[PDB]
Amino acid sequence: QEDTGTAITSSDNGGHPGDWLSYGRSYSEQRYSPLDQINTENVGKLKLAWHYDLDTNRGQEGTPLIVNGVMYATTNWSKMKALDAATGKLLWSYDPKVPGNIADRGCCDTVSRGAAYWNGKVYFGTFDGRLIALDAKTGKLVWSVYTIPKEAQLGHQRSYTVDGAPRIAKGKVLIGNGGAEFGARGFVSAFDAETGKLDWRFFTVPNPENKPDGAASDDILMSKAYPTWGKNGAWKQQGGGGTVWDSLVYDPVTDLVYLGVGNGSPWNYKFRSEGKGDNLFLGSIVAINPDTGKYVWHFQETPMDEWDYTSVQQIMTLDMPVNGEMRHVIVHAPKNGFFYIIDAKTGKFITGKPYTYENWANGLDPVTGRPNYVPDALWTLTGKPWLGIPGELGGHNFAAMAYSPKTKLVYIPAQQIPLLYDGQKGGFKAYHDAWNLGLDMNKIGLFDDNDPEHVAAKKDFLKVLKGWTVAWDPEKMAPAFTINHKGPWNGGLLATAGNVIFQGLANGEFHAYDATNGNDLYSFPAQSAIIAPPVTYTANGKQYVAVEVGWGGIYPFLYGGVARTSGWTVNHSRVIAFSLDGKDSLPPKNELGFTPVKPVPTYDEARQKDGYFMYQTFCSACHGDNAISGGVLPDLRWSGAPRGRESFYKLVGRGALTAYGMDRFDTSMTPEQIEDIRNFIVKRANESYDDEVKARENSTGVPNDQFLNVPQSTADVPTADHP
Amino acid sequence: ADEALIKRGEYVARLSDCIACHTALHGQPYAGGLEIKSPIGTIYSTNITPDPEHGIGNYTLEDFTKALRKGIRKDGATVYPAMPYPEFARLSDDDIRAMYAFFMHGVKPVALQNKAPDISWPLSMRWPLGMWRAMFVPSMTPGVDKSISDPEVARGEYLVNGPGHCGECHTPRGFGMQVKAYGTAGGNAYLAGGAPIDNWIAPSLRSNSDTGLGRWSEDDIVTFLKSGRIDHSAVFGGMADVVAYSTQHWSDDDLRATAKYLKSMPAVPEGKNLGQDDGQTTALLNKGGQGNAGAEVYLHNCAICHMNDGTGVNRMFPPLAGNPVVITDDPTSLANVVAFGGILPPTNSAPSAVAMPGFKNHLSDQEMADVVNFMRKGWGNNAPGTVSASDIQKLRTTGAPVSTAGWNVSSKGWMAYMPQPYGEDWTFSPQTH
Amino acid sequence: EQSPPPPPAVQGTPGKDFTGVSPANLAGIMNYCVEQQYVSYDEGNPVLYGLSEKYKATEQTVGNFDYALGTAGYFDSNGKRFYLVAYTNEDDRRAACHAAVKAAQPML
């Protein structure tokens, strides 16, 4: 108890130094810990203290909570484990038994990013859309609610999943959802932390007919947001998007709730809203009253969003000397590539500058903060292909960023993955159980053939694909220093008072760097890539640094053959913790992944083209582009299903593996299209089997660096003025 | 040197599958207490931890050798034939020494008291057990047989007849409940199938194509032993935990030698339990069953995973047409695997962890008997006999799903992942239903 | 300022002359002006819906780069490009959208 929330507020002022009670360890989400037991002159002696093997084989992005010696960690498939924070012994476990038939309704893996703690209870959201409260000690269920209202509009397609970490403000659990990649109406709901009753709801986009929803957002939606949404478009049927799935901040200093609103649905601006209107509360930060849920202010970072530039990224609150005077401000690093400083109280725009390379805008308007779009960046209006940097994954993603008041620096894990945007041919066509982005799925993706155009495209993509960590200085709005990496999709950042920053890399290494100059101080091989942010805490008086390891997310699921440029990795999901006198060691594991198997030699050429097309619109999101898996999900080229028509249909059309995530696709594809996909997969396997076998033939048994396209020689950190 | 000896002893212990049957379900390792059914009564595994009072802490090397090779405890009485001491009598001196070192130093001492066997006093006397060893267990030279010219075949034979004890399950037992052949020189009865043990039947390991490994390749045997998932078979039942606890930890050389020895055994007469498929069953299932109860049950419950031709999916769903487990004379294991499903973790060549649901609650006894008869007489299968509802109801009471817990301990492979619920509106029947 | 530095001043020649902007460029300018205000929601919307329909600015399957060139602050006139994200006063941004409405009046 201790009136939780008071403890979380005091955590920002030195109170509770050895606890991690919120998602960002505090209401400010600074992710800064005042524990100086591990410092720069000492972190090099760090050793692994303990580990705990998780029972999932997908990505782990959760941020564990630590309450007075007990670690509550949420894993893939929304499972929760309470372990001993000092020895890593499982105190208890709980799984909500998420149904397997909705796994394809989530954009990007069945991940769970965190939980919340309040008054001796732990609250978390399940992938199917349930908010569950458990006793923090016994682990028994207290209450469980369904967060998606059966009534209300929500659009015709309602693909709702919950993967973010709930936040609790004044005894109210706030939770959003995701699914605008498929088509959904974004909203954030506040439930009672004691009884589970719905306290209020806030819809981030207006309903199709400008009618009241009975929620707390009615006045602002019907008076301000509705006139900014075209006159008639695909937003009325799809939902409009604006899902809040990552950022949910409570500020007790200003007593406000900040929501990071996601992208539109579909991404196509012309399809969604005729290419007209600002589409208010889309790709914006909205601050509302934590009590009644009423709108207070907003700031739209990305008007008329069409590149999947969500403002859902981490929102942080600091105190800075603005105009030679101390001021409580909000710092944001969304997908679009701009670092924003705005006023936390009134929402007034203060400043904004690109922290990475972006070609979609020539800076921001100094008088409004609205981006100065280049005319060609609006590919939807021009109707021409656009090579957008940042791509749909943005310069920043769910990976956490940290703050150090000792150095006054914001450490951001940044990436560079460009995307080719082009409109869907023939107009918008929404598909059941498919990504309804409204763009051409033939143009996206790379090929391994000998076509000079394809060779040049792949070479350029590998040239401008990068990953690094930048120490932004908000006072100067310039990078203090950078730490380069081989590739993107690394873990989050953690900052402590020992001037040390911790981060997990995509090659499977946990690293500790100096917080003042970025010098590498400690490195540890974790046997699998780390995509979750590290946390630190105290148990029995001694400091521990823990992190969840597991390869997953949208990047390995989608980009496939180019997803291992940072180094070879497979998924060995677990939770590890290091202490100053740890004496543990990771047992050996099999790192061969999914090895090639010789396919059938018969395929149809006439069904190639369209077959490829179908694979790019239904199966590429999970099994990788061009039928090459990223190392988490099975590779379809070596699968035994495509060896026959009947087995392939019964697996894809009928969903024989629904209990594990393979759902039926007969609700959107005829058997002929599934057969076309099968022929395309067989042709790809026949093309690539010999090359894959040759690549895996070496001492280690895994493909070499040249096959994985890992970058020999260091690559320049992009920054502005150049990629 | 001591650490190397401990590691070697651990490897030999895993090679002999000591941990599988010397640990009770959800119990301390090597602490015993496992219920083993016997025709006389029920026996319990003794704890073999280095505990000086409960375990074998006071056992010397000579006592260990006597217990393993002759089945004589430190007391002096003879153990029950539940101990595979007829097979462990072939263990070499170096292997026994390494295992003794591992058990005296590498095992954590647990203090669980050995449960007494619940056998009535007239049949609980221990003196006749030695006479059983004298009558049915011949003297065996410990170590590799010095008659096989090929070193790999000799090592495989030592593994099969020594630390690993396949004949304990795969060899028929005689009137004295003893294996009719301890080696390939015994005759065609060596590794020629067995009676149902724990409602599971170990089929023939001989060269007959219908029921044995005649259609199995050496690489097929190696991969099946290492991971349990090949393109035409999938491990289950007792083999499942034999692979999970013991065989998956074997070195590649040992697995290759075992497969070579198995494939090099003398030829055995072919059976008549498998025929040629003319598509009659496939046509019947394509029509819709048309009045065949077994065909209707298969179409509505099983055809989604195993296809209408009984071929399944390679390395994902094992075939039912020509599968020796479906072909064997005794259908007990067939109905057992139908009633209770089975979870298999993903492998390098067989990704996408798979899960048979247990149909003991979805289907009635008559429906499962009908489906078993249909699969036994379908796609050219010629398995004899018929299954009634009484046998199904007997199997549903005496039977339980496999542990799937050995897949998740001290393994370089993936965990055995439990399946998620299908959903509220799920059905295995086709859309026309 | 000398606080965390503001975005640099934009480059371009502001103007409110709309002689030869041509259709689907005035439609883009009015898309830029209906949002961000500076005209209205009631006298700018009829221009946008009616200038983008008569002259097919969007068409849901067609290009017309002139719409994007004008959704931003740019518009061409007599072979010269003028930028509306200049005019830092924001009172010259107004009476420029009004001038665009006046210029579009004979066009509709």
Ligand code: HEC
């Ligand atoms: C994300 C939700 C997915 C999409 C979209 C598609 N697939 Fe999938 N597939 C997914 C998972 C998580 C799994 C593994 C299942 C398990 O048991 O772990 C699979 C598996 C398959 C397989 C089986 C491969 C084998 O076992 O060797 C096949 C043949 C397959 N998937 C095909 C397939 C096709 C054709 C798709 C496009 C329509 C497709 N999948 C989409 C997850 C997802």
Ligand code: HEC
């Ligand atoms: C399952 C079939 C077993 C395997 C494999 C191994 N052992 Fe065993 N062992 C088993 C039983 C059921 C019993 C007791 C029988 C009875 O008469 O009560 C035993 C007994 C032993 C002992 C004797 C301990 C004593 O009772 O004081 C020892 C030392 C022993 N077993 C060791 C041992 C080793 C080293 C094994 C691997 C080679 C091994 N056993 C395998 C059952 C089974």
Ligand code: HEC
């Ligand atoms: C009793 C516990 C067993 C011991 C000891 C061994 N095996 Fe076994 N095996 C057992 C069963 C109940 C089965 C049934 C089929 C299954 O997959 O569930 C099997 C099967 C095999 C097979 C496959 C045969 C087929 O599919 O036709 C093989 C190749 C096999 N077993 C090999 C094997 C070896 C080499 C053993 C000594 C180490 C061994 N088995 C021991 C039960 C038991």
Ligand code: HEC
């Ligand atoms: C998909 C979920 C399945 C359905 C529906 C049915 N079976 Fe199946 N079966 C499936 C798998 C993945 C496996 C592998 C075994 C493992 O241990 O998991 C099996 C296995 C069998 C077997 C054993 C043969 C062998 O393992 O080689 C039999 C006899 C069998 N299945 C029959 C069967 C029947 C009769 C079904 C309809 C009731 C049925 N299966 C449904 C997958 C699936």
Ligand SMILES: O=C(O)c1cc(C(=O)O)c2c(n1)C(=O)C(=O)c1cc(C(=O)O)[nH]c1-2
């Ligand atoms: O529009 C949406 O609703 C939506 C949702 C999500 C999500 O729920 O994670 C992502 C995205 N979009 C998206 O564009 C994206 O790049 C992304 C990455 C991830 C992830 O978990 O790594 N989620 C999402």
Ligand SMILES: [Ca+2]
């Ligand atoms: Ca998105």
